[PDB]
């Protein structure tokens, strides 16, 4: 179950199918740089608490590295190293001039005050500033970090520099150089990939039977988005149960009666199980709940033409192979959710020029990137007769392998 | 700064204006009981996790205490204490035979399965059963809890009793003794207070000018209600702007353009600002969005005869003094939102009798309870020449202080 | 033939058409608790006779259980089990906060004296008291039991409690907390399903139609009102006696009548709807409305 060694296997199988040699795996199986730091913080009670921080930079062969920072009690070195590698793949799937980066601090932010989080954000930037910046390694928001933390981190970096460096970090508030169209960008990308998968199977959304798992932020918005496309949303589900209407659920009713924590099954008596919801006959199954939802146990039972992953990691390895050889078009999470990294990149470009796009322009620019990435992965999947996940990994890693070779590193 | 100490300040000022001694505040400033439990739960991986739970019972002078149980990572002992005191004030305002209670468990329900939450729910009932029950302390839903969690807790308690105790806990499924007429109880309650405030100012609702700020859950509901009663809803808003039509905005058409975050403004961009929305001349202004919308800078320029808080804290203290000085009838949020507690109470009564009311009967009784509360707070404010928020507080504490004296506790 | 297996298949068909799976039938096909007792009674000639008694509590997922007590030479464990399950269904149809219960003593009341019957009635309450009472299991009259039997069992329970618990047992005399409108109740129930049948065959509560005759009558577009629905006035007024006992407040015949009509009204439009929207006979639609609430409760509470 170890993430990092599992991530290495992803890189190894993709470099190996691309035809690169053992030397190339050895170069890419670990970050080029990993910086571990100890950040003293003056806490609100006057004691100094010392926090462990990490910043991984996987490969900068293609450009500066990119990836967010998370504040979690369970952050580890192996976690940060693995996710920096996943960032490399995410950037390449959508063709950014970026290698993968990642940072983490071991702390419980929910147990710290405003002033403590700011002082820890500043001390983090102080601790790593020698290897980061607009041209080296660009952090961004992640678990338990948000625009205010990006704003403190930017101010600290810019004071050290003696000038404004908004391109240091992405996810900034608008007034600090943030990018319009940033909040919806991941979900909008799932919307493009859904509509692009539908064309590949010549499935008209209007009247198509679609079931989505989950009814929180991702699931609310995806059930509403397909209901307004005229599609029939015959199933939605909760942590507590699921709903099924062969004629299509009244999404606007559920939407109205849901509570602020993504639950709505609870109001209802007639209720079906999540496991039965996944096995419903439908055109588009969209898992938007949680991981390991389609497994070797139900992979032969799901009868959807298209499965777009909105949750992270909802299909297991053996289930992915079972789905592809049943003809099902599986769009992997690492492609479906690439809208967030793409708009991070747009923010950094705006900071480089000093000129800022309108929302309609970011959307236009965001749409083509997704439309183009989907086609790159789909074409690699079908040309090489592989599942779209491995094809996505291959598209994800090949720029870094090509650049590493050209620059003389292998 | 802090909610508990801020809640202590509210109880102190109310008891002071009612005329009690310093002893009465010494009795009421902290809950009579506070139970902190540790709950071990078997997790799905087989390990054991030990969770922290709290149950606060503010004052049982008037009857058993009443209040919900929240499952949140940010639950704290001071928060549970302070909210129990708020439940006393609520139960007082609407004249229930209850005192204030509340619970909380420090967990992240988002990282827990359905089985983990059930076992935690049963372990919490087990851990506090000695001091709660139909006649002692009656819990209910709150943040991250729901009718399924109430069903589990009611089952655990009944198992412990060796007989069915539906009145232990409210928010139950109907098949386990919950109340009809519950789902929109809080929103119906604001609707009653708006109409009753309107008749005080001798305003015909059937042609009145209504401005609502916010267009999510509450704003969308209030707007359709006012639209139906014949009111002209001349303004609505969301986070991105506001719409204005002097003759009525056509709510049914707007409720169809909603995007699942409760946004409608982006589609028009012949839009007015939130600031201007709030100062439009009208009869009934209803801030049903965020907080601190009516402030010292705002309040001199609001033009509504009546302001009904349908969100928590949208009017500041400075602003509250001003609207009272300008002769605007302000309905505080602690009063306008009391319908959820009222219908909680009706579920408990029906449990006591073993007899259950139709939707219509629950509605009739809810109206009379909300009218009587509005009338009681209006008479305290008008008789003492004070603002309605301080009057609401005073009605809310009055019964507990009168009962505490009568039973000899002070 | 055997009432019990016959009733198990009734539950089985209704559960399966409502969509639950086998585990709900496994929970609901036998009672959660069945208590068999031996009651020593002193007879008039100074001898001791020992009697067998049963109490069946089918399911309390919805609330305390409810059903009558019969004194009969042919009382049997299977009869008592099966009849408590019919109580679940009768309560479900009128939408009562009750599960099904039933009890019986194997005895010949006609060959017993008044004194003997009282000493038996008391020994029954003492035998089963640990699992009965106004919040757990509420008995009542049935074959060869009546108000006087109920008064003796109520008095024995109260004595054991050290306080009056009228809510223990229904069919009590008025002066002991019984309900007005009771003697008419079951008859009025039929009188009311007849009247809503207007907007037509109404059964006589024993079980007078065979499986195939209900198939022929329904396929001929003739409306049928099953026994388990039309007889439900008795269970309804029973519930009203309990609620009045819970309050300590007692209604006039007029009000007991208004509330009985409303209940039989809704119970007819629930079975009628269920037969029209699913194109089934009303008897099967009645078993479904009867077992529905108990099924959903067992599911919410975590039992299956
Ligand atoms: N916009 C996107 O598509 C997007 C972006 C980022 C992440 N995600 C992923 O989507 C998933 C949900 O994200 P979110 O913001 O909607 O979360 P959320 O917490 O707001 O909503 C989660 C939903 O999943 C349900 N759920 C939880 N456990 C479940 C279970 N075992 N079975 C079924 N349903 C269950 C919850 O009850 C709720 O309805 C996560 O895996 C996350 O990584 C999606
Ligand atoms: N999850 C939590 O921690 C949490 C916290 C507070 C409340 N809640 C719950 O959330 C629900 C809130 O109901 P609601 O009716 O407020 O719905 P909502 O939050 O779904 O929508 C609120 C509306 O206000 C709008 N809005 C936001 N900022 C605005 C601004 N500055 N000016 C004008 N409009 C603005 C939103 O766009 C939307 O139209 C309640 O159930 C409440 O108990 C949850």
mmCIF file with all atom_site columns, C-alpha atoms in Angstrom, chain B residues 27-107:
data_model
loop_
_atom_site.group_PDB
_atom_site.id
_atom_site.type_symbol
_atom_site.label_atom_id
_atom_site.label_alt_id
_atom_site.label_comp_id
_atom_site.label_asym_id
_atom_site.label_entity_id
_atom_site.label_seq_id
_atom_site.pdbx_PDB_ins_code
_atom_site.Cartn_x
_atom_site.Cartn_y
_atom_site.Cartn_z
_atom_site.occupancy
_atom_site.B_iso_or_equiv
_atom_site.pdbx_formal_charge
_atom_site.auth_seq_id
_atom_site.auth_comp_id
_atom_site.auth_asym_id
_atom_site.auth_atom_id
_atom_site.pdbx_PDB_model_num
ATOM 1  C CA . UNK B 1 27  ? -25.058 29.970 38.159 1.00 0.00 ? 27  UNK B CA 1
ATOM 2  C CA . UNK B 1 28  ? -25.828 30.426 34.462 1.00 0.00 ? 28  UNK B CA 1
ATOM 3  C CA . UNK B 1 29  ? -22.392 31.432 33.054 1.00 0.00 ? 29  UNK B CA 1
ATOM 4  C CA . UNK B 1 30  ? -21.256 27.804 32.900 1.00 0.00 ? 30  UNK B CA 1
ATOM 5  C CA . UNK B 1 31  ? -23.334 24.678 32.275 1.00 0.00 ? 31  UNK B CA 1
ATOM 6  C CA . UNK B 1 32  ? -24.422 22.834 35.401 1.00 0.00 ? 32  UNK B CA 1
ATOM 7  C CA . UNK B 1 33  ? -22.957 19.607 33.972 1.00 0.00 ? 33  UNK B CA 1
ATOM 8  C CA . UNK B 1 34  ? -20.285 18.986 31.374 1.00 0.00 ? 34  UNK B CA 1
ATOM 9  C CA . UNK B 1 35  ? -19.376 15.420 30.467 1.00 0.00 ? 35  UNK B CA 1
ATOM 10 C CA . UNK B 1 36  ? -16.150 14.746 28.545 1.00 0.00 ? 36  UNK B CA 1
ATOM 11 C CA . UNK B 1 37  ? -15.933 11.119 27.410 1.00 0.00 ? 37  UNK B CA 1
ATOM 12 C CA . UNK B 1 38  ? -13.387 9.024  25.564 1.00 0.00 ? 38  UNK B CA 1
ATOM 13 C CA . UNK B 1 39  ? -14.924 6.561  23.087 1.00 0.00 ? 39  UNK B CA 1
ATOM 14 C CA . UNK B 1 40  ? -13.020 3.604  21.572 1.00 0.00 ? 40  UNK B CA 1
ATOM 15 C CA . UNK B 1 41  ? -14.182 2.537  18.111 1.00 0.00 ? 41  UNK B CA 1
ATOM 16 C CA . UNK B 1 42  ? -13.122 -0.493 16.086 1.00 0.00 ? 42  UNK B CA 1
ATOM 17 C CA . UNK B 1 43  ? -12.070 0.782  12.659 1.00 0.00 ? 43  UNK B CA 1
ATOM 18 C CA . UNK B 1 44  ? -12.510 -1.125 9.403  1.00 0.00 ? 44  UNK B CA 1
ATOM 19 C CA . UNK B 1 45  ? -8.787  -1.919 9.244  1.00 0.00 ? 45  UNK B CA 1
ATOM 20 C CA . UNK B 1 46  ? -9.101  -3.603 12.669 1.00 0.00 ? 46  UNK B CA 1
ATOM 21 C CA . UNK B 1 47  ? -7.184  -0.991 14.680 1.00 0.00 ? 47  UNK B CA 1
ATOM 22 C CA . UNK B 1 48  ? -8.849  0.891  17.512 1.00 0.00 ? 48  UNK B CA 1
ATOM 23 C CA . UNK B 1 49  ? -9.224  4.655  17.537 1.00 0.00 ? 49  UNK B CA 1
ATOM 24 C CA . UNK B 1 50  ? -10.158 6.579  20.703 1.00 0.00 ? 50  UNK B CA 1
ATOM 25 C CA . UNK B 1 51  ? -12.358 9.646  20.104 1.00 0.00 ? 51  UNK B CA 1
ATOM 26 C CA . UNK B 1 52  ? -13.169 12.561 22.395 1.00 0.00 ? 52  UNK B CA 1
ATOM 27 C CA . UNK B 1 53  ? -16.821 13.368 23.055 1.00 0.00 ? 53  UNK B CA 1
ATOM 28 C CA . UNK B 1 54  ? -18.611 16.099 24.977 1.00 0.00 ? 54  UNK B CA 1
ATOM 29 C CA . UNK B 1 55  ? -22.134 16.570 26.283 1.00 0.00 ? 55  UNK B CA 1
ATOM 30 C CA . UNK B 1 56  ? -23.030 19.929 27.823 1.00 0.00 ? 56  UNK B CA 1
ATOM 31 C CA . UNK B 1 57  ? -26.212 20.477 29.837 1.00 0.00 ? 57  UNK B CA 1
ATOM 32 C CA . UNK B 1 58  ? -26.534 24.167 30.550 1.00 0.00 ? 58  UNK B CA 1
ATOM 33 C CA . UNK B 1 59  ? -29.522 24.373 32.935 1.00 0.00 ? 59  UNK B CA 1
ATOM 34 C CA . UNK B 1 60  ? -32.351 21.945 33.638 1.00 0.00 ? 60  UNK B CA 1
ATOM 35 C CA . UNK B 1 61  ? -34.321 24.414 35.761 1.00 0.00 ? 61  UNK B CA 1
ATOM 36 C CA . UNK B 1 62  ? -37.127 24.548 33.198 1.00 0.00 ? 62  UNK B CA 1
ATOM 37 C CA . UNK B 1 63  ? -37.092 20.892 32.128 1.00 0.00 ? 63  UNK B CA 1
ATOM 38 C CA . UNK B 1 64  ? -34.820 18.384 30.427 1.00 0.00 ? 64  UNK B CA 1
ATOM 39 C CA . UNK B 1 65  ? -32.106 19.953 28.343 1.00 0.00 ? 65  UNK B CA 1
ATOM 40 C CA . UNK B 1 66  ? -32.217 20.021 24.540 1.00 0.00 ? 66  UNK B CA 1
ATOM 41 C CA . UNK B 1 67  ? -29.558 20.322 21.839 1.00 0.00 ? 67  UNK B CA 1
ATOM 42 C CA . UNK B 1 68  ? -27.868 18.619 18.868 1.00 0.00 ? 68  UNK B CA 1
ATOM 43 C CA . UNK B 1 69  ? -24.695 16.566 18.400 1.00 0.00 ? 69  UNK B CA 1
ATOM 44 C CA . UNK B 1 70  ? -22.078 17.556 15.825 1.00 0.00 ? 70  UNK B CA 1
ATOM 45 C CA . UNK B 1 71  ? -19.264 15.377 14.390 1.00 0.00 ? 71  UNK B CA 1
ATOM 46 C CA . UNK B 1 72  ? -16.602 17.881 13.363 1.00 0.00 ? 72  UNK B CA 1
ATOM 47 C CA . UNK B 1 73  ? -12.799 18.106 13.508 1.00 0.00 ? 73  UNK B CA 1
ATOM 48 C CA . UNK B 1 74  ? -13.092 21.552 15.161 1.00 0.00 ? 74  UNK B CA 1
ATOM 49 C CA . UNK B 1 75  ? -15.462 20.595 18.009 1.00 0.00 ? 75  UNK B CA 1
ATOM 50 C CA . UNK B 1 76  ? -14.137 22.082 21.258 1.00 0.00 ? 76  UNK B CA 1
ATOM 51 C CA . UNK B 1 77  ? -15.304 22.030 24.874 1.00 0.00 ? 77  UNK B CA 1
ATOM 52 C CA . UNK B 1 78  ? -15.864 25.801 24.878 1.00 0.00 ? 78  UNK B CA 1
ATOM 53 C CA . UNK B 1 79  ? -17.873 25.615 21.661 1.00 0.00 ? 79  UNK B CA 1
ATOM 54 C CA . UNK B 1 80  ? -20.113 22.857 23.023 1.00 0.00 ? 80  UNK B CA 1
ATOM 55 C CA . UNK B 1 81  ? -20.515 24.819 26.269 1.00 0.00 ? 81  UNK B CA 1
ATOM 56 C CA . UNK B 1 82  ? -21.368 28.094 24.498 1.00 0.00 ? 82  UNK B CA 1
ATOM 57 C CA . UNK B 1 83  ? -23.827 26.492 22.068 1.00 0.00 ? 83  UNK B CA 1
ATOM 58 C CA . UNK B 1 84  ? -25.672 24.738 24.899 1.00 0.00 ? 84  UNK B CA 1
ATOM 59 C CA . UNK B 1 85  ? -26.166 28.165 26.456 1.00 0.00 ? 85  UNK B CA 1
ATOM 60 C CA . UNK B 1 86  ? -27.487 29.395 23.111 1.00 0.00 ? 86  UNK B CA 1
ATOM 61 C CA . UNK B 1 87  ? -29.971 26.470 23.155 1.00 0.00 ? 87  UNK B CA 1
ATOM 62 C CA . UNK B 1 88  ? -31.245 27.726 26.523 1.00 0.00 ? 88  UNK B CA 1
ATOM 63 C CA . UNK B 1 89  ? -31.774 31.152 24.969 1.00 0.00 ? 89  UNK B CA 1
ATOM 64 C CA . UNK B 1 90  ? -33.504 29.652 21.915 1.00 0.00 ? 90  UNK B CA 1
ATOM 65 C CA . UNK B 1 91  ? -35.728 27.367 23.987 1.00 0.00 ? 91  UNK B CA 1
ATOM 66 C CA . UNK B 1 92  ? -36.612 30.376 26.126 1.00 0.00 ? 92  UNK B CA 1
ATOM 67 C CA . UNK B 1 93  ? -37.522 32.661 23.202 1.00 0.00 ? 93  UNK B CA 1
ATOM 68 C CA . UNK B 1 94  ? -40.067 30.172 21.888 1.00 0.00 ? 94  UNK B CA 1
ATOM 69 C CA . UNK B 1 95  ? -41.178 29.125 25.410 1.00 0.00 ? 95  UNK B CA 1
ATOM 70 C CA . UNK B 1 96  ? -40.295 25.455 25.430 1.00 0.00 ? 96  UNK B CA 1
ATOM 71 C CA . UNK B 1 97  ? -40.256 23.318 28.628 1.00 0.00 ? 97  UNK B CA 1
ATOM 72 C CA . UNK B 1 98  ? -36.554 22.801 27.957 1.00 0.00 ? 98  UNK B CA 1
ATOM 73 C CA . UNK B 1 99  ? -33.147 24.018 28.978 1.00 0.00 ? 99  UNK B CA 1
ATOM 74 C CA . UNK B 1 100 ? -30.033 24.186 26.835 1.00 0.00 ? 100 UNK B CA 1
ATOM 75 C CA . UNK B 1 101 ? -27.880 21.235 25.860 1.00 0.00 ? 101 UNK B CA 1
ATOM 76 C CA . UNK B 1 102 ? -25.334 20.236 23.219 1.00 0.00 ? 102 UNK B CA 1
ATOM 77 C CA . UNK B 1 103 ? -22.791 17.610 22.213 1.00 0.00 ? 103 UNK B CA 1
ATOM 78 C CA . UNK B 1 104 ? -19.867 17.129 19.929 1.00 0.00 ? 104 UNK B CA 1
ATOM 79 C CA . UNK B 1 105 ? -17.317 14.521 18.902 1.00 0.00 ? 105 UNK B CA 1
ATOM 80 C CA . UNK B 1 106 ? -13.877 15.422 17.573 1.00 0.00 ? 106 UNK B CA 1
ATOM 81 C CA . UNK B 1 107 ? -13.739 13.457 14.324 1.00 0.00 ? 107 UNK B CA 1
#
